[PDB]
Amino acid sequence: GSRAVELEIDGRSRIFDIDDPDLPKWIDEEAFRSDDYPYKKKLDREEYEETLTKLQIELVKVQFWMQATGKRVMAVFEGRDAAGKGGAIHATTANMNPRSARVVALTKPTETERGQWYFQRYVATFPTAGEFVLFDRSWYNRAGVEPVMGFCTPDQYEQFLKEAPRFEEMIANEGIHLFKFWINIGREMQLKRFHDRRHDPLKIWKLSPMDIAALSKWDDYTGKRDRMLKETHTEHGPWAVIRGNDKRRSRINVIRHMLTKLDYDGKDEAAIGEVDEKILGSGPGFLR
Amino acid sequence: GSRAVELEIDGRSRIFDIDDPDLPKWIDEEAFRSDDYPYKKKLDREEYEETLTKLQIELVKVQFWMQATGKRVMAVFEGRDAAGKGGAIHATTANMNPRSARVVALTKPTETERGQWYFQRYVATFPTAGEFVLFDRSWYNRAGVEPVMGFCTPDQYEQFLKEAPRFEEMIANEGIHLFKFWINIGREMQLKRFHDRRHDPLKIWKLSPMDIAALSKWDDYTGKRDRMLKETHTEHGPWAVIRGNDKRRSRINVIRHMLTKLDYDGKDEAAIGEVDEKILGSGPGFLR
Amino acid sequence: GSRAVELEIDGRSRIFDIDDPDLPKWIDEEAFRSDDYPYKKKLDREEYEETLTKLQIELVKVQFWMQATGKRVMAVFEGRDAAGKGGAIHATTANMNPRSARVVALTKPTETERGQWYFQRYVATFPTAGEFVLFDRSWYNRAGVEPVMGFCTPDQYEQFLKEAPRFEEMIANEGIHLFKFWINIGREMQLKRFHDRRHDPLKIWKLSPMDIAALSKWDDYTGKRDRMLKETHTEHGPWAVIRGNDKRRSRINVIRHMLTKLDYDGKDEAAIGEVDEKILGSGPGFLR
Amino acid sequence: GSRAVELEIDGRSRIFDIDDPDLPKWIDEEAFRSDDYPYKKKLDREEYEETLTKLQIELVKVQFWMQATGKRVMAVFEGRDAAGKGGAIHATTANMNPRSARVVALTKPTETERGQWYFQRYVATFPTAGEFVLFDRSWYNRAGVEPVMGFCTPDQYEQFLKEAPRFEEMIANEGIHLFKFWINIGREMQLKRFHDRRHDPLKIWKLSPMDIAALSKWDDYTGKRDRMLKETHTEHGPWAVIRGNDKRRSRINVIRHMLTKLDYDGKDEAAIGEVDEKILGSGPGFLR
Ligand SMILES: Nc1ncnc2c1ncn2[C@@H]1O[C@H](COP(=O)(O)OP(=O)(O)O)[C@@H](O)[C@H]1O
Ligand SMILES: Nc1ncnc2c1ncn2[C@@H]1O[C@H](COP(=O)(O)OP(=O)(O)O)[C@@H](O)[C@H]1O
Ligand SMILES: Nc1ncnc2c1ncn2[C@@H]1O[C@H](COP(=O)(O)OP(=O)(O)O)[C@@H](O)[C@H]1O
Ligand SMILES: Nc1ncnc2c1ncn2[C@@H]1O[C@H](COP(=O)(O)O)[C@@H](O)[C@H]1O
Secondary structure, three states: OOEEEEEEEEEEEEEEEOOOOOOOHHHHHHOOOOOOOOOOOOOOHHHHHHHHHHHHHHHHHHHHHHHHOOOOEEEEEEEEOOOOOHHHHHHHHHOOOOEEEEOOOOOOOOHHHHHHOHHHHHHHOOOOOEEEEEEOOHHHHHHHHHHHOOOOOOOOOOHHHHHHHHHHHHHHOOOOOEEEEEEOOHHHHHHHHHHHHHHHOHHHOOOOOOHHHHHHHHHHHHHHHHHHHHHHHHOOOOOEEEEOOOOOHHHHHHHHHHHHHHHHHHHHHHOOOOOOOOOOEEOOOOOO | OOOOEEEEEOEEEEEOOOOOOOHHHHHOOOOOOOOOOOOOOOOOOHHHHHHHHHHHHHHHHHHHHHHHOOOOEEEEEEEEEOHHHHHHHHHHHOOOOOOOOEEEEOOOHHHHHHHHOOOOOOOOOOOOOOOOOEEOOOOOHHHOOHHHHHOOOHHHHHHHHHHHHHHHHHHHHOOOHHHHHHEOHHHHHHHHHHHHHHHOOOOOHHHHHHHHHHHHHHHHHHHHHHHHHHHHHOOOEEEEEEEEEOOHHHHHHHHHHHHHOOOOOOOOHHHOOOOOOOOOEEEOOOOO | OOEEEEEOOOOOOOEOOOOOOOOOOOHHHOOOOOOOOOOOOOOOOOHHHHHHHHHHHHHHHHHHHHHHHOEEEEEEEEEOOOOOOOHHHHHHHHOOOOEEEEEEOOOOOOHHHOOOOOOHHHHHHOOOOOOEEEOOOOOOHOOOOOHHHOOOHHHHHHHHHHHHHHHHHHHHHHOOOEEEEEEEEEEEHHHHHHHHHHHOOHHHHOHHHHHHHHHHOHHHHHHHHHHHHHOOOOOOOEEEEEOOOOOHHHHHHHHHHHHHOOOOOOOOHHHHHHOOOOOOOOOOOOOO | OOOOOOEEEOOOEEEEOOOOOOOHHHHHHHOOOOOOOOOOOOOOOOHHHHHHHHHHHHHHHHHHHHHHOOOOEEEEEEEEEEEOOOHHHHHHHHHOOOOEEEEEEOOOOOOHHOOOOOOOHHOOOOOOOOEEEEEEHHHHHHOOHHHHHHOHHHHHHHHHHHHHHHHHHHHOOOOOOOEEEEEEEEEHHHHHHHHHHHOOOOOOOOOOOHHHHHHHHHHHHHHHHHHHHHHHHOOOOOEEEEEEOHHHHHHHHHHHHHHHOOOOOOOOOHHOOOOOOOEEEEEOOOOO
């Protein structure tokens, strides 16, 4: 295998060939149970849909209340590569008005942007009255992919970790409600999903040069993740941390978290349910 | 009862009360067959999803070919209110990369924009290399909703009809491939969809005072549609015109049309299928 | 007089008619010496031109140093209406490259802009590598003209005073050198300059309804000045405060200040000269 | 002595060393009379200022009329390097309100801009109601500096020549008044000004590597000028062509031309005077 990589999965030497259509047993058997996942089987499709429908009905109410009051929301999505960021975003926006809820998904910075204040091109996307803005990756590029891949210098990395709390304090002081979600998955789950994307012609667009590099960089991402959650989890900018091995439970609890934190007119606490504390936690210390 | 309207439906007076949860039989019985619709029943869902999957797999190939060549695509979506243009956009973008495929859904112009060249704020959204940009409504606001609702003057309307072909001639000469889709529905189908949206807590966001006002302005929108298709169907900017009573057949044939017109790498004509000529036609005079 | 205003000049009732082409003696004879001005006559024109020329030669060096190193500079100009903000900006940019030094002169916020984070439209103007950005009025609109005329609420005013220091902390931590200049003049000098502009067909455009109304708001503007200087003079964003009764001395010492604070290659200490401490001071308490 | 270039001056080899402080007599003696210049001596300095003052008083009237009517103006400035475009722009804007009259001086395109429609980044600077926008260079980069220096391909060059008339047809049809000014100078005048800029510490910022390369490329620019004037001078976008050897006469007739073409309230034709038809002509053929 040309793209096959060697990996150290706790003392054990493993080879992963993403192009091999056959998934080996040590990934197949451990993918769902990795990352101390609390559930034995994934949430059934029809129970997920019944619950998600009820949650999206509540988000329609949220949007109506935001147009009426002018309230603005920003929701940041980050995590392990292949953890399910885009799916949590689509589950949130599926039944929202595209003229008042929009997704930010920026590309690599231009020469002009690289010479700007790092946050400038993100401020350009900030919401006006009533808008719900969701970030498919965010300024937290500089706390993960950029230092791991050397797209920013160590000093730029250290600088970003000191400025992000200041940036988000202004956001919160302005009255924009800022959500930050870190969607985690276990190591073998990431391998399984890279394999799934590689061998599905409908999903192979999800598999980028970055992800193939992320394979040998698991521990470095772990370090950057831990460092980032500990140093940028502040009162003004709290991190909600998700065990995301089950995409369905991930999406449901992301949305439950936002509904509970918003004091929107018409809110039906029965339809929201409870955030599963086994799936969604706060700040550092949630992931072992 | 507070918003019931009296309508003239092909010679007879009819009452439509959108807030009445019961749909009148004269709407429910005629909605699907309205607008000379060529089929007796809905396309089967399972068949539709199987076909949509093959089309989205081709759209992955399209996006790969656009990235490698730099080719750019713009897809304009217009039509009768409630004809499902957002549904056609989601079916196109569901498995495309949000960093290279994006949706434009502008809100009403600010005072600054109203004093600008009408087209300026649309040029601001134009694609860079490899981008696929989809317009959920477009500069064709000024050929429909604006003149019907008096948001632009008649001089401004007549000016737009003359200037849009010149605008699209420059788009086409730049080598951006411009698709324009008009999705039609029959009058009874519009009422049924308005009613369904009003009484579904998940879809009530899809209604707006613009829609509410469109109830009493059917014949006005008809003439604005005819005038616009006549005056702005050109070689450089041709209109693809859709009988959209069946949302599944609408979405499939929209995507098939684009796949047929794009000469992309890896194109599988057997997977694409044939554009259904009973559903998708060209220019003025296809619809009655 | 159609728009004559009655004023109280230290317990004495005075009447100022700006449309009267005759300036009264009490304005003409006290204009230059108001605000405890330290010099008895205005600076000799030839000496001013010789000095400004040397100073603009140093600014040429500054611009070359900024292109090579990438250093970015922002210069904010606020003051009494008619104090000479544009003249200080023109003296600074007269021999600078328009592609790397630019002036920001925003108009009143659009509806979209009013629903945004107040600072958003100002971040959009921030410099990329090498750029010198000057603000002909700035975000400090909300600490002066906006509360005085009621274009913002008391709550928005108090919020700005808390947030402007945090905003400029981020600017300073980014390594953009931010200058802030308050150009003060005496009351009678303001009256004289309004009069001069009213009766000069070349300068009448400088007279706006905001200035006509400022005629009666002298004391209100005084309090806003004092409050804003004390609460937004910080280590990260220091205020330079200028006695501006003499436009020539105002322009020279503004530029001297910036030349002294920038550590640019080729700095000719002898060319810069001494900042006149009788003209330019730091922070509150300089004016009285 | 480093970057001396050999030039062919109508049958003779000449050496020009821009770094030599002494200017050769063959340049000095021919500079003002070059380009079939029709006057023996430059315009009297005090007479120029008196005329310019009266023209700028007329431009105040223009601005007030544009504010009241919403009328918009765009003024494009191109010409030989060192012809004085920036000087003509400052003479127009010196006594205009910088909140409604603004200068566009774009830098080289980003990667993103290079993948866009060439005109898109210029459309982003178009005027809203009442604005007067001046271009210090324009989209005509692609008919001059870009093809001469190889920053665009021949296909892109030919495409621009065909598309610029279509672009300006839409500008004119929109009711924006578009002026295009080509400021020409003689070859020895250009060498003289280059030499003057190089050896004046106040103006050396006016030189660029682009200017240095222009030295050896005079004949290329001559053809590029003539092609552009022939192919893009149209009814909707006419070129005003200036003999600019005397910068005072260039500035005055540029402004006179605009005042003549604008039907503004309070127009005083005696103040405007007559455009000097020996200095300012129309389209190709005016220049040798
Ligand atoms: N050369 C680069 N410099 C800075 N950021 C980059 C660079 N290349 C990729 N990125 C960013 O890293 C993140 C991951 O990139 P990629 O995997 O290629 O696409 P996606 O995130 O959509 O899956 C993106 O936000 C991307 O813009
Ligand atoms: N006052 C207005 N002036 C101009 N355009 C308007 C105005 N109000 C609404 N519109 C436009 O009419 C179109 C239909 O409005 P709406 O139904 O709310 O959007 P949507 O397509 O998402 O349902 C939108 O493009 C909207 O911007
Ligand atoms: N209605 C308003 N709301 C907010 N700001 C305003 C409003 N009107 C004027 N301003 C601002 O007050 C400042 C003074 O403007 P003005 O005196 O009218 O003209 P200028 O600043 O060009 O001399 C400007 O920055 C202006 O944008
Ligand atoms: N590498 C480049 N590519 C395209 N345009 C450029 C490039 N370099 C300079 N220019 C443009 O050429 C013109 C001359 O530059 P300057 O003399 O520096 O004003 C300006 O419009 C520049 O933006």
